[PDB]
Design a protein around this ligand. Structure first.
Ligand code: NDP
Ligand code: NDP
Ligand code: NDP
Ligand code: NDP
Lengths: 250, 250, 250, 248
């Protein structure tokens, strides 16, 4: 009963902020070699590279717009050279916006589809040759895609699509040693929430807290505990599953 | 009471063959004015066109590739012209292919997403103004997106995305009197199966029958029974739901 | 096309109040012969009886405590003697209470299990011979058994148990012509909602109304629209399903 | 994972899934209390490996169909452990009976053990879990699928999810988490005691339905129990975790 992660190689999309950042740092502290990407150079990406260097291990953070297939194929050329193999993939990169559905432009629909759904598919497709004969693929889904949220049907559409992708991939590749699962998250504190001043903050927090069974929002490190279990052989009979990490929300 | 469908106006995408043909014809015979579409001109679209005008009522069948956003806008100006209003929309048009996932070309991924997911989204977005203050939107999903099927991860991804779209649209427009639901179909005999030689047809017929509770495959008219119910005021408190019409299949 | 319920024979448990009363009256006014039961005589049982005898058809309302298996057997001696056959069964009788779980007496747990689960099972088992070779069994479930409600875990346990019973019965009897489904209800207006002082008619109606997509509570007649569909041949390919009639709640 | 030193109760630990979970938790340094219905080779040999491992483990008889014996079981758990960190509702029974021929007493036995027994175990365990604790009930993927001749079994296994969801809502702010592990098909002694012929056929039959091409083992179940027992899952409650090899 040991996670046994030290020495594994992971790819985590969207590691500069939020959930992806916490997963990257927690996997790295546990001795996983982490490859991550981000869309745009920023102080968050720069501080990310700084912590990865501060820690021991063979970590890499490259810019790659998942809306762009050329940049995804380039990311994986770098992954194939620096790592050569993979044990874990975490599809975490995603975008959201609130547009009244009737006003949602076709281009904003297309962007959210390109990043959240087509981006995840291309990442997985490029990762399959690197995963070899054994590997664990983890996609970050959303509890909200079962509940429904006004002004985000495009987001809930893409997040729910990940579950159907995952279920079929679990069937197609299970006998080859690849496992595919979804983590359905509740509401997780991120820097964008702590960048809000107290009023439009301690009002979101209690609005969502009452919705939960635990009475609090999640953190990126709690998500990482579940990623760690799915990365490990303690979950070797788990595939095609949607694991809720949501505090029992609604 | 009664279905009370007579005189309503419905739009059914992909009405020339298979499930959609069954739904169009059954709704027409019940006195619903049906507007349908199809991708290319064919013997099926021609024969469908003849049958609808020989039936009573004001029906229309137009060519429109849902992979093309401009043809959807065109289709809907023709709908707003000829009908002026809608009571029912049925997103039935869909495509499928069986490709090893590692070999799935990006353009084919994009084709199945363009038709099954983005096309459905554009049809609903264009329909909302025409549905007004009461309306019923029905999207055709699939039991298989919960089960997983090898070589169709792109198909089960798009079909599962329809449920996530539907749930949020139901929350968003529910107080406007608009309802959104998904019909998750099992296996339905279509022309494409009675056109295979005797028993590769009977072999898959038995293969799929053994998985059902009922011991048989579904028919397009059985789907029509569920569309009829969702179009009707007998389902006026039903929204955001996935209704299985699948014979109890696994 | 049409529902075709005229002439069918139905059994509806718990028909004197609320959802059950609404289903009994709607089926009776549709020309179905309705046999119903209730636990004690009240203003409600008497008005139901009077209200039935004023409608065409052969209807019966008898008392039977579903917690007592001997009274269930007795009930079905009466159904066999007055009806001889059944086309439709609706397991609607159910009880609920709000008790802190640590304080829940063993006997109160036993009560709601005996009525909501063991009672429904015995009703179905007695009904199977009377349903013959064609028949539709409909059990009343609850959306809340997916959500969770404090002080009602015994209730949600039994309501969720009905889905598991139904799924297996659909597999076991589908090839014999019997269909089994659950209707999962949201919050429905009943007499018990109308008997509170407006001290909470309503805070409660706003509290539950805001959780729905439609912005209102359900009514018993809206439930009857779904019962009507499931009793009908329009749903002949629907079995083993959980049908949500909940206004898109949570 | 940080499991060493915790105290756990696992019902039905003498055979099958429960035995694997008991032994795996014990070998991780968890003090394990378990129970079983009949004294047998399995319970005696179980007691011999638990004393060979060291640690403070206990195996008592308690028929979970009898509320009195559940009370007595929790008297002894309260006295030897004083508190609990983990509860695993694992004890369960099944039978394959044509539904029309199912005797009321057999319906009642399946309900008493699989649903009411689990409820009583949880209700008695809540005082002992105190301010922090993790409750895990063993459910079944088959209760979503439906299986002929066992509707009574799938009824009770599905009931556990409705119970769990409400208990998670009720007790989450008190520090208690409630989750369900829905199992697929798991290899037990029960299957390896069948002749090569019928066993080979059953193995192929269920394997074809899984994504992984094999049946599960009790140790694979224990890996999920271990995660739900640990603070790595401290934001997981009210969830149904499938440990089923992707079975249909
Ligand atoms: N409560 C929550 O936060 C919930 C989150 N989720 C999901 O978790 C995941 C991460 O959530 P969260 O941390 O809150 O999101 P954030 O907005 O905080 O960060 C998202 C990360 O994804 C990267 N990203 C966005 N677009 C791209 C792109 N085209 N290419 C490469 N990287 C990109 C970002 O990089 P960059 O800095 O360059 O912009 C960023 O690092 C998402 O998939 C989300 O849907 C699920 C339900 C609830
Ligand atoms: N067993 C089954 O039948 C299953 C079906 N479904 C779903 O049912 C729906 C219809 O299924 P089915 O009848 O089997 O499919 P069919 O192959 O029989 O074709 C259905 C219709 O969709 C039209 N279509 C395809 N692409 C387009 C497009 N770009 N624009 C407009 N119309 C298009 C087709 O037009 P054209 O004739 O011009 O090619 C045709 O009229 C699909 O959405 C499917 O996912 C769900 C589960 C199982
Ligand atoms: N209304 C809602 O918001 C919800 C409804 N449901 C379910 O719908 C069904 C309808 O319940 P509802 O109308 O709301 O509640 P009510 O209390 O208003 O009516 C319940 C009926 O059950 C009758 N009955 C017959 N035998 C028994 C027996 N042994 N024990 C108890 N009742 C018996 C009762 O008769 P008597 O008059 O003698 O008491 C009564 O008529 C229930 O099963 C409920 O769980 C599910 C979720 C939400
Ligand atoms: N493929 C599988 O094995 C699956 C198993 N499950 C669930 O896993 C759990 C155990 O399954 P499995 O290992 O296969 O079954 P087993 O028969 O192998 O073991 C059952 C264990 O529970 C004990 N037990 C049964 N009834 C009682 C009772 N009244 N009181 C105390 N102990 C009792 C038994 O004790 P005793 O030795 O005295 O009989 C035994 O130790 C069950 O909950 C089952 O529903 C779920 C899905 C699939």
């Amino acid at each position: 009963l040991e996670l046994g992660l030290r020495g594994k190689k992971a790819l985590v999309t969207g590691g500069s902020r939020g959930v992806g950042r916490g997963v990257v740092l927690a996997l790295a502290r546990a001795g996983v070699d982490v490859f991550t990407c981000y869309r745009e150079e920023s102080d968050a990406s720069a501080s990310l590279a700084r912590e990865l260097k501060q820690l021991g291990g063979d970590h890499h953070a490259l810019r790659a717009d998942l809306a762009d297939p050329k940049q995804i194929a380039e990311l994986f050329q770098e992954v194939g050279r620096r790592f050569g193999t993979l044990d874990v993939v975490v599809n975490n990169a995603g975008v959201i916006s609130h547009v009244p559905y009737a006003e949602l432009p076709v281009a904003e629909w297309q962007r959210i589809v390109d990043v959240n759904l087509t981006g995840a598919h291309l990442v997985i497709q490029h990762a399959i040759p690197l995963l070899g004969d054994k590997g664990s693929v983890i996609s970050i889904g959303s509890k909200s895609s079962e509940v429904g949220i006004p002004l985000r049907a495009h987001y809930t559409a893409t997040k729910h699509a990940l579950r159907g992708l995952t279920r079929s991939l679990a069937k197609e590749y299970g006998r080859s040693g690849l496992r595919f699962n979804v983590l359905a998250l509740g509401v997780v504190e991120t820097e964008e929430l702590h960048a809000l001043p107290d009023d439009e903050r301690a009002e979101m927090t209690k609005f969502y807290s009452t919705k939960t069974a635990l009475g609090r929002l999640g953190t990126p490190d709690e998500v990482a505990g579940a990623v760690a279990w799915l990365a490990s052989d303690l979950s070797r009979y788990v595939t095609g599953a949607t694991i809720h990490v949501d505090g029992g929300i609604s």
